[PDB]
Ligand binder design. Structure first.
Ligand SMILES: [Mg+2]
Length: 396
């Protein structure tokens, strides 16, 4: 068949329209080239590009048979010669996420402005979560040389409007994600552990000052580690056990790992905290890798030093590429999720770094940003929807 022809049903959706349209097309010399159909709130769109013999396609026979059979049931339909038309659309060059509780129209409208301001076509939009946070995904195509300015744009927009914004490359390698590492304190686990231990030595005050002074990027990580652990010199090492019992998991964390197992992920943690305390919980979670510092003990009591080598900032980036080596996962399929300057070097070495309840020094450099203290929102940023999760969970 010689010449091409584009057909397009619009109108309220109903059953059988897709069948009806193609039986009808069989009666004329018709072979498909592309078919695109969707139903959004019942509005049916259907876009069939065919190429059929110039014989039939120059004839009113086809026109009348289609038009008649569509408008009969209550939908519109258009028919036009094609010849030059692109057969199948290009893929999207980036994907963007917008999340928040709530997402104001002004907020979302600002994202779309700055996206427009740069030449970026919104190729598609859809909602990924209604719980615990409205999240909406946008596949966008970006002018070459703009995407640096894009994340500049979007971060700003995020701050002024109180929504979380996230911009990944939507490419083949970059989307077979396979490896995730979590910080522990204030990411995977609620609270600072070095404060649960501090509070046992009645020095919860001094220590919590320094800790926030560090996680924000004001004191050398080693230097503030020594000094805070210094406060613990004297405690019976039984207290380690006491703090690993009190620990709580970030909300939704179980669901985050359980789902990250589904997609075949290697999951690990990377702290500057204390291996003896993550070692229990990283067993129960059946994690694949733990990199953490060691508390010195003598005759059963804590000396207040840490055993070296210390896992400083750059030690956390080191800590991840070692994992990514041991499991064979290149760096660009590696996910990292932190919450403080401690993690600046991890997130920037990972292929997709995620600031979670981050101090602002982090948000400034993470490829993405979540403000709201639910760890399941990490799933949405990785290609999953609240619908899938509850489906897969519900089957068991
Ligand atoms: Mg932390």
């Amino acid at each position: 068949p010689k010449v091409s022809v584009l057909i397009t049903v619009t109108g309220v959706d109903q059953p059988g329209v897709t069948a009806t349209l193609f039986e009808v097309l069989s009666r004329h010399g018709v072979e498909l080239l592309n078919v695109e159909q969707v139903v959004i709130r019942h509005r049916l769109t259907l876009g069939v590009l065919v190429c059929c013999p110039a014989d039939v396609a120059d004839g009113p026979a086809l026109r009348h048979d289609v038009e008649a059979a569509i408008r009969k049931v209550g939908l519109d339909v258009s028919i036009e010669r094609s010849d030059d038309v692109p057969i199948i659309r290009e893929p999207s060059t980036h994907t963007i996420f917008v999340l928040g509780r709530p997402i104001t129209a002004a907020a979302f409208g600002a994202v779309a402005r700055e996206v427009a301001a740069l030449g970026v076509n919104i190729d598609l939009i859809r909602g990924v979560s209604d719980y615990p946070v409205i999240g909406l995904e946008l596949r966008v195509s970006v002018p070459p040389g703009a995407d640096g300015a894009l994340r500049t744009a979007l971060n700003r927009v995020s701050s002024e409007e109180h929504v979380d914004v996230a911009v990944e490359d939507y490419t083949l390698e970059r989307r077979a994600k396979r490896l995730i590492v979590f910080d522990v304190d204030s990411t995977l686990v609620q609270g600072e552990v070095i404060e649960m231990l501090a509070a046992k030595a009645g020095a919860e005050g001094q220590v919590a000052a320094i800790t926030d002074a560090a996680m924000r990027g004001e004191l050398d990580f080693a230097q503030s580690l020594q000094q805070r652990v210094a406060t613990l010199a004297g405690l019976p090492a039984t207290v380690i056990d006491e703090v690993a019992g009190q620990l709580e998991l970030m909300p939704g964390a179980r669901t985050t790992l359980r789902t990250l197992r589904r997609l075949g992920y290697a999951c690990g943690v990377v702290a500057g905290g204390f291996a003896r305390i993550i070692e229990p919980l990283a067993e129960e979670l059946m994690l694949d890798y733990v990199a953490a510092n060691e508390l010195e003990i003598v005759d059963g009591t804590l000396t207040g030093r840490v055993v070296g080598p210390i896992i400083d900032r750059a030690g956390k980036a080191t800590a991840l590429r070692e994992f990514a080596q041991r499991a064979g996962v290149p760096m660009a399929q590696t996910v990292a999720v932190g919450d403080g300057a401690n993690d600046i070097d991890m997130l920037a070495a990972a292929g997709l770094g995620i600031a979670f309840n981050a101090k602002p020094a982090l948000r400034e450099v993470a490829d993405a940003s979540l403000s709201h203290p639910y760890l399941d929102t990490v799933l949405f940023l990785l290609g999953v929807t609240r619908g899938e999760i509850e489906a897969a969970d519900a089957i068991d």
